RNA sequence: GCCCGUCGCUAGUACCGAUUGAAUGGCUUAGUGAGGCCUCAGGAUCUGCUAGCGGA
RNA sequence: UUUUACUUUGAAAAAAUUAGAGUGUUCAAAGCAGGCGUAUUGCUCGAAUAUAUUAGCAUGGAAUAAUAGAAUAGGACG
RNA sequence: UAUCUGGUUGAUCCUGCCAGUAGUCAUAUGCUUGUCUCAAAGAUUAAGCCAUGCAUGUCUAAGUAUAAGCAAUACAGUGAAACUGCGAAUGGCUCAUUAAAUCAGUUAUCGUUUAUUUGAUAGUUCCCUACAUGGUAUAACUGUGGUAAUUCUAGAGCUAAUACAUGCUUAAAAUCUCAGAUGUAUUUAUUAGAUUGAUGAUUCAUAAUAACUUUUCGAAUCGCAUGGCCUUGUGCUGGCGAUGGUUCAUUCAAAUUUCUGCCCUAUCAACUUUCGAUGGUAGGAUAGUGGCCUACCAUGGUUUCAACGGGUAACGGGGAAUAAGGGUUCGAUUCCGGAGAGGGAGCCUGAGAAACGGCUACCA
RNA sequence: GUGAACAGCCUCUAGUUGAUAGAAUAAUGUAGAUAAGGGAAGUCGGCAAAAUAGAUCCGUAACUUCGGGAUAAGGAUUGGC
């Protein structure tokens, strides 16, 4: 199968290497999961040592963390809008680490209302204790009017079977919005 | 090559076993266990070649099957159980106890000890780590883990192990002027006091040992075993106490019995 | 002699790479798979013998259908299996009327009763109690060891 | 490093979060480590903006192997240099020596500035490319 | 005295040589491409739950 | 407390093999044996040592051979 | 044991080779061959082809026994077959490929997997069984067969588990959310991890918060003794073990890996880079690092200090022969490492195989 | 317009619709074509015909007067949106 050895991949001097030690199992590779969206389908791969990997194909929900307040709500993934490695993954809506996706944002809005009560996008003094330092950001909150949050996938869906991630903020959000407005 | 090896050809066994060259094709491969493969001493070797109690491996197995042998408090019915440094071999029949220590020539000497001190053992602290749930523990030279150690116990120290409750009763620290055993290298089996420890960050730490005869030799930190303070060993030293007499003096001592 | 396969759905025989938990193949080694030729599912003139299962008996008995009838070779072995066999309730202490048999070899006819599995026995109860007591005893020992280690840490932190 | 954010992905030190809620001073929190073995983390590494996940100070690599010294013969790669390590090989039969050399590809952090010459010290790290197994840890641009 | 070369015979060795010679092996463009593996599906019949709904 | 080469010492370089200590295989090649008083309810010596010097490691030296300091002083100590 | 001698001449002194001479665990072969010890042995040519037979099976007290198998009120002993578990990845053989490849010495894993051994380690499980759940399970067994033929197996009737799948009991104490949760396993994010542990060094060990899981682990197991207390009951407690189990450590290992060192050849001087060559970013894949693979980007990387190419009747080394010293030649072969099982390629199981006395296809 | 194009094909302005006609559809002809399997066995001879063909990318030998041979040979792609 796919081999990760350096017996092929000719040497740094350019010399072609002769073939010894016909392909070894401990050097094997496997095919990409190419995680799609919707109708969760996770397969178990028996890996070395008797361990187990989870090839997530067609993942619909993931655990996304705000990271400004530490909520990490489970949400639905809408689609892929940006991918630094290949625009084809955006076109095919392929879930993978570091992919920029859109998430539902309704659990985050509900948590924000039940925690601060400050009408983000439209037990009495707990909100008073969570005092006027409650504005999140003019770019993290403007997405709530549309009910879609830009997030970066942090897990490896083809490796762990999960599609967790975090909501972009600050300079990362500014960079990714600049990329989006440059490519669209 | 496709998996772990299970045979041990003769002339590939550690030379400190002093195995016969032409006894057979194979040597007793030390099973997995506490100490090592090279630094170990199989019970079959200790019983058929060091004590001569058993004549064959079948007789070694017969001895082991009736719970006669006991390593560090447990029966250890394994024919090739890797007994090693500071391990206590006790046989209830023929009741005497041996602490497996290194003679001056680096072999595992037959060193009879008494029951009143076969209870405990010494162990070099290989590592000090925080385990699950924030519980600190120490890993010793014989693969023992001991939870909740003294907060002053560091690496290269020695810990007395009860070997009945399996807990730390006392600990010696690594410092200049402490009695140390050499557990590997050219000076394997020597006993002396620490003169100085050169650090060599990144590389290997070196320690200078001075025997009672004022001979000073340097050795790697990996194979030094603190056994107490000078003149007060926490264990019973072997017949030669790691002196490393020169060959001429050895010949003189041999010829002093006529 | 090639057996019919359950769902091949062909009038002839074809070669398939067969697996552990399938018919027409018994693996000789764990993970072994063999390419064997088996016959299709739909019957045709090629078959030497067919096998049928009677699901409805309509009319006059065949001379080898009901008059020649053989009994079940083994009675139920598990306790709850015997309970379901004889309709008994839970609290019925099923060790008395377990099916038995006689071996007439030396005019002794010593009965050969089966063993019963999952039988509720005081040995199993003692094992469970010992396991639970071990769990609680190690839990208590770890708690007290942690307490005394905390005491040692505080006593050594008092020297500032 | 000349508009560091020049890649398609966002360049940032992993798991180093800069909270936009708190009103901190620098607002550009930068992680760094001590490379060890007496190798002083440079001020460019301290105060820079580059990411260089392969940096021995601000990256996820560690210097844990051999410490070699060599002369830089090529700086034409991106954050990678080639050093020439000259030595004398002894031929016993003639009781003499012959000049030999082995080029070593070394990753150079943007903290250091390296040109042709510039005898550098490199420390072994994990494989970070097909050929590179060493990270520059001391520049000694002399 | 010693001696050199052509030519002629015998024997041996190697060379050039039309035959777009022949055979073997390595590498390789292009084309076809078995087989297992991953994957999009597919549903024999197999059994559970209330015509339906899950699982293999 | 520039950078090296070089050289001393030490750890290292599996065992077997080699050289080599001891030892009446009857001698020897070999082997790691064995030896000593009895009518035991047994005492004990050994299976050393040297060799690899390529390369790496630790360390003393600073001759020999190379390398750089301060010259448009952008120099050294407060 | 730092040795020479014969041969060019009519004679001489040289150069110079031929020849002699001695050794060879260095191969044949001829003649000869009484004794004791020791014992290489289809490597060279053909890693050419193979008839036949054997070379991997395995049961304790302690997984499953109704053999209609043996023996003098459940079997309790022995024990066929079978299920289950483990092993079959060790060993042994050969040297075909392989020239920076293997290998040797020496490093690293702060870059990973690790059955087994040894040590330590889990009071947190549930939204009408635990004095213990199901067949949704079946083998052997019984009976009916097919095939000329194979370690081919079909239909039918049972039957169990440490097989398969579910599934509780552990109070007590404990901190947050607004009565619930907080064990552990997985994933992500965040925080502490100082000068409250360690390293030369870490985003380390570990802990905490918020959450997430086609959902893990948290013995529904077995043997021998049965003891104690008491309301003497299907009462309540309590031994030694065996097996299994999550995690950590250890051991056996494995996989990559630092530096330096390989024979002849220029009648091989440029090589690599379209089809990855050198590096960067990101992803995928892997057990994990890594152009290992992909997308984008840059034009790099090696070389007269011999790259690249070609040859090897080249596996490398420990070592062997011969040797004043220096060297020369050999090493298929008793040990270590590698590779292969006619040539390739692919893969299942398994901790560990790209296994071949395992499978699949192609080629012969 | 298509197309590299004053190529071929269709069209605009302009011009022509002028060639003796009608009915049938035999052979043999003239001109244009197709053809199973084989593939030059036909024939003096591949005559005739067929095959190839544009463009883009790859790749290109002997020989050579070093300029060529060369579109050598031999391959892949081509539409629409
Ligand atoms: Mg001669
Ligand atoms: Mg042969
Ligand atoms: Mg083997
Ligand atoms: Mg961590
Ligand atoms: Mg990467
Ligand atoms: Mg050789
Ligand atoms: Mg060869
Ligand atoms: Mg060899
Ligand atoms: Mg050969
Ligand atoms: Mg071998
Ligand atoms: Mg193999
Ligand atoms: Mg063969
Ligand atoms: Mg194979
Ligand atoms: Mg075979
Ligand atoms: Mg085999
Ligand atoms: Mg045009
Ligand atoms: Mg035709
Ligand atoms: Mg045709
Ligand atoms: Mg043709
Ligand atoms: Mg003709
Ligand atoms: Mg003709
Ligand atoms: Mg003719
Ligand atoms: Mg023509
Ligand atoms: Mg052409
Ligand atoms: Mg031509």
Swiss-Prot record, chain A:
InterPro entries with a match to the protein in the record: Ribosomal_eS8, Ribosomal_eS8_CS, Ribosomal_protein_eS8_euk, Ribosomal_Se8/biogenesis_NSA2
Principal location class: cytoplasm
Q: Which residues carry this modification: Phosphoserine?
A: 65, 68, 72, 85, 138-139, 142, 145
Positions carrying Phosphothreonine:
61, 106
One CC-aspect GO term: 90S preribosome
Transmembrane regions = none
According to the UniProt entry, its GO molecular function terms are: structural constituent of ribosome
Q: Which UniProt keywords apply?
A: Cytoplasm, Phosphoprotein, Ribonucleoprotein, Ribosomal protein
Q: Which Pfam families match?
A: Ribosomal_S8e
Q: Where located? A: Cytoplasm
Please name the PROSITE patterns in this protein's record: RIBOSOMAL_S8E
Q: How does it assemble?
A: Component of the small ribosomal subunit (SSU). Mature yeast ribosomes consist of a small (40S) and a large (60S) subunit. The 40S small subunit contains 1 molecule of ribosomal RNA (18S rRNA) and 33 different proteins (encoded by 57 genes). The large 60S subunit contains 3 rRNA molecules (25S, 5.8S and 5S rRNA) and 46 different proteins (encoded by 81 genes).
Q: Report the protein name in the record.
A: Small ribosomal subunit protein eS8B
- The encoding gene is RPS8B
From Swiss-Prot, chain B:
Offer a single GO CC term for the protein.
cytosolic small ribosomal subunit
**Residue numbers of Phosphothreonine PTMs:** 114
Name the principal localization, coarsely classed. cytoplasm
Q: Which family does it belong to?
A: Belongs to the eukaryotic ribosomal protein eS4 family.
The record makes one more remark, namely: Present with 573 molecules/cell in log phase SD medium.
| Role of this protein | Component of the ribosome, a large ribonucleoprotein complex responsible for the synthesis of proteins in the cell. The small ribosomal subunit (SSU) binds messenger RNAs (mRNAs) and translates the encoded message by selecting cognate aminoacyl-transfer RNA (tRNA) molecules. The large subunit (LSU) contains the ribosomal catalytic site termed the peptidyl transferase center (PTC), which catalyzes the formation of peptide bonds, thereby polymerizing the amino acids delivered by tRNAs into a polypeptide chain.
Q: What is this protein called?
A: Small ribosomal subunit protein eS4A
**What gene is behind this protein?**
RPS4A
UniProtKB/Swiss-Prot annotation, chain C:
**What keywords does the record list, in alphabetical order?**
Cytoplasm, Isopeptide bond, Nucleus, Phosphoprotein, Ribonucleoprotein, Ribosomal protein, Ribosome biogenesis, rRNA processing, Ubl conjugation
Q: Where is this cross-link: Glycyl lysine isopeptide (Lys-Gly) (interchain with G-Cter in ubiquitin)?
A: 57, 72, 90, 155
Q: Which domain of life is it from?
A: Eukaryota
Keyword check for rRNA processing? yes
Q: Which GO terms describe its molecular function?
A: structural constituent of ribosome
The residue stretches assigned to a coiled coil in this entry are: none
The terms describing its cellular component in GO are:
90S preribosome; cytosol; cytosolic small ribosomal subunit; nucleolus; nucleoplasm; small-subunit processome
Q: Where in the cell is it found?
A: Cytoplasm; Nucleus, Nucleolus
Positions carrying Phosphothreonine are 104
In the record, biological process GO terms are: maturation of SSU-rRNA from tricistronic rRNA transcript (SSU-rRNA, 5.8S rRNA, LSU-rRNA); translation
- Miscellaneous information on this protein: Present with 66000 molecules/cell in log phase SD medium. There are 2 genes for eS6 in yeast.
Q: Which family does it belong to?
A: Belongs to the eukaryotic ribosomal protein eS6 family.
In UniProt terms, what function does this protein have?
Component of the ribosome, a large ribonucleoprotein complex responsible for the synthesis of proteins in the cell. The small ribosomal subunit (SSU) binds messenger RNAs (mRNAs) and translates the encoded message by selecting cognate aminoacyl-transfer RNA (tRNA) molecules. The large subunit (LSU) contains the ribosomal catalytic site termed the peptidyl transferase center (PTC), which catalyzes the formation of peptide bonds, thereby polymerizing the amino acids delivered by tRNAs into a polypeptide chain.
Protein name, as recorded: Small ribosomal subunit protein eS6A
Species of origin: Saccharomyces cerevisiae (strain ATCC 204508 / S288c) (Baker's yeast)
Fragment boundaries within the full protein? Answer: 60 to 219 of 236
From Swiss-Prot, chain D:
Q: Write down the superkingdom of origin.
A: Eukaryota
Alphabetic keyword roster: Acetylation, Cytoplasm, Isopeptide bond, Ribonucleoprotein, Ribosomal protein, RNA-binding, rRNA-binding, Ubl conjugation
Biological process GO annotation list? maturation of SSU-rRNA from tricistronic rRNA transcript (SSU-rRNA, 5.8S rRNA, LSU-rRNA); ribosomal small subunit assembly; translation
Keyword Ribonucleoprotein in the entry? The reply is: yes
InterPro entries annotated for this entry? NA-bd_OB-fold, Ribosomal_uS17, Ribosomal_uS17_arc/euk, Ribosomal_uS17_CS, Ribosomal_uS17_N
Q: What is its main location?
A: cytoplasm
Q: Where in the cell is it found?
A: Cytoplasm
A Pfam family (short name) is: Ribosomal_S17
The answer, when asked if Iron is one of the entry's keywords, is: no
Any coiled-coil ranges, and where?
none
Any one GO molecular function term: rRNA binding
The record's listing under SUPFAM superfamilies reads: Nucleic acid-binding proteins
A GO CC annotation recorded here is: cytosol
How is it modified post-translationally?
N-terminally acetylated by acetyltransferase NatA.
Cross-link Glycyl lysine isopeptide (Lys-Gly) (interchain with G-Cter in ubiquitin): located at?
12, 43, 53-54, 76, 93, 102, 130, 138
How does this polypeptide assemble, per the annotation? Component of the small ribosomal subunit (SSU). Mature yeast ribosomes consist of a small (40S) and a large (60S) subunit. The 40S small subunit contains 1 molecule of ribosomal RNA (18S rRNA) and 33 different proteins (encoded by 57 genes). The large 60S subunit contains 3 rRNA molecules (25S, 5.8S and 5S rRNA) and 46 different proteins (encoded by 81 genes).
Family of the protein in this entry: Belongs to the universal ribosomal protein uS17 family.
What else is noted?
Answer: There are 2 genes for uS17 in yeast.
Q: What is this protein called?
A: Small ribosomal subunit protein uS17A
Query: Gene encoding this polypeptide?
Result: RPS11A
């Amino acid at each position: 199968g796919i081999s990760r050895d350096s017996r092929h991949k000719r040497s740094a001097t350019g010399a072609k290497r002769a073939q010894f030690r016909k392909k070894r199992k401990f050097e094997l590779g496997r095919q990409p999961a190419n995680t799609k969206i919707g109708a969760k389908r996770i397969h178990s791969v028996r890996t070395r040592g008797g361990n187990k990997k989870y090839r997530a194909l067609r993942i619909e929900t993931g655990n996304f963390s705000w990271a400004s307040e530490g909520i990490s709500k489970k949400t639905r993934i809408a689609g892929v809008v940006y991918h630094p490695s290949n625009n084809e993954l955006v076109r095919t809506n392929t879930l993978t680490k570091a992919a920029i996706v859109q998430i539902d944002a309704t659990p985050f809005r509900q948590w924000f209302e039940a925690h601060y009560g400050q009408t983000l996008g439209k037990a009495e003094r707990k909100w008073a204790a969570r005092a006027a330092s409650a504005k999140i950001e003019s770019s993290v909150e403007s997405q709530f009017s549309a009910g879609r949050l830009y997030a970066c996938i942090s897990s490896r869906p083809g490796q762990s079977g999960r599609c967790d991630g975090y909501i972009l903020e600050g300079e990362e959000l500014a960079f990714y919005l600049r990329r989006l407005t440059a490519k669209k | 090559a496709r998996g772990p090896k299970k045979h041990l050809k003769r002339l590939a066994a550690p030379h400190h076993w002093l195995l016969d060259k032409l006894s057979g094709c194979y040597a007793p491969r030390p099973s997995a266990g506490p100490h090592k493969l090279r630094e170990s001493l199989p019970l079959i070797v200790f019983l058929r070649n060091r004590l001569k109690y058993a004549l064959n491996g079948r007789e070694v197995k017969a001895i082991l099957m009736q719970r006669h042998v006991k390593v560090d408090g447990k029966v250890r019915t394994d024919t090739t159980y890797p007994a090693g440094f500071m391990d206590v071999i006790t046989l209830d029949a023929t009741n005497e106890n041996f602490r497996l220590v290194y003679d001056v020539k680096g072999r595992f000497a037959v060193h009879r000890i008494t029951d009143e001190e076969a209870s405990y053992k010494l162990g070099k602290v290989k590592k000090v780590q925080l385990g699950k749930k924030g519980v600190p523990y120490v890993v010793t030279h014989d693969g023992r883990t001991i939870r909740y150690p003294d907060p002053n116990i560091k690496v290269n120290d020695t810990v007395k192990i009860d070997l009945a409750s399996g807990k730390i009763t006392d600990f010696i620290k690594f410092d200049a002027g402490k009695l140390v055993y050499v557990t590997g290298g050219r000076n394997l089996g020597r006993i002396g006091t620490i003169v100085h420890k050169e650090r060599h960050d990144g590389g290997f730490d070196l320690v200078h040992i001075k025997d009672s005869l004022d001979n000073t030799f340097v050795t790697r930190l990996n194979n030094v075993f603190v056994i107490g303070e000078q003149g007060k060993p926490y264990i019973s030293l072997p017949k030669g106490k790691g002196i490393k007499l020169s060959i001429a003096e050895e010949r003189d001592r041999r010829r002093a019995q006529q | 002699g090639f057996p019919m396969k359950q769902g091949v759905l062909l009038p002839t025989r074809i070669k398939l790479l067969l697996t552990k938990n399938v018919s027409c193949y018994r693996p000789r080694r764990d993970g072994e798979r063999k390419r064997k030729s088996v016959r299709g599912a739909i019957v045709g003139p090629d078959l030497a013998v067919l096998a049928l299962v009677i699901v409805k008996k309509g009319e006059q008995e065949l001379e080898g259908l009901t008059d020649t009838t053989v009994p079940k070779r083994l009675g139920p072995k598990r306790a709850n299996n015997i309970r379901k066999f004889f309709g008994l309730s839970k609290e019925d202490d099923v060790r008395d009327f377990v099916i038995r048999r006689e071996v007439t070899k030396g005019e002794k006819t010593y009965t050969k009763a089966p063993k019963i599995q999952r039988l509720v026995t005081p040995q199993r109860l003692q094992r469970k109690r010992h396991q639970r007591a071990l769990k609680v005893r190690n839990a208590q020992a770890q708690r007290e060891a942690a307490a005394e280690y905390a005491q040692l840490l505080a006593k050594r932190l008092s020297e500032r | 490093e000349l508009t560091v954010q020049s890649e398609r992905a966002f360049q940032k030190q992993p798991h180093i979060f800069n909270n936009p809620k708190v009103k901190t001073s620098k607002r550009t929190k930068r992680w760094y480590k001590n490379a060890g073995l007496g190798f002083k983390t440079p001020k460019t590494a301290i105060e820079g903006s580059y990411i260089d996940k392969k940096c021995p100070f601000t990256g996820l690599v560690s210097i844990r192997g051999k410490i070699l010294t060599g002369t830089v013969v090529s700086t034409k790669m991106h954050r990678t240099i080639v050093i020439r390590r000259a030595y004398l090989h002894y031929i016993p039969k003639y009781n003499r020596y012959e000049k030999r050399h082995k080029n070593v590809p070394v990753h150079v952090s943007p903290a250091f500035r390296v040109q042709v010459g510039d005898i550098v010290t490199v420390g072994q790290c994990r494989p970070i490319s097909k050929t590179v197994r060493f990270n520059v840890v001391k520049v000694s641009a002399a």
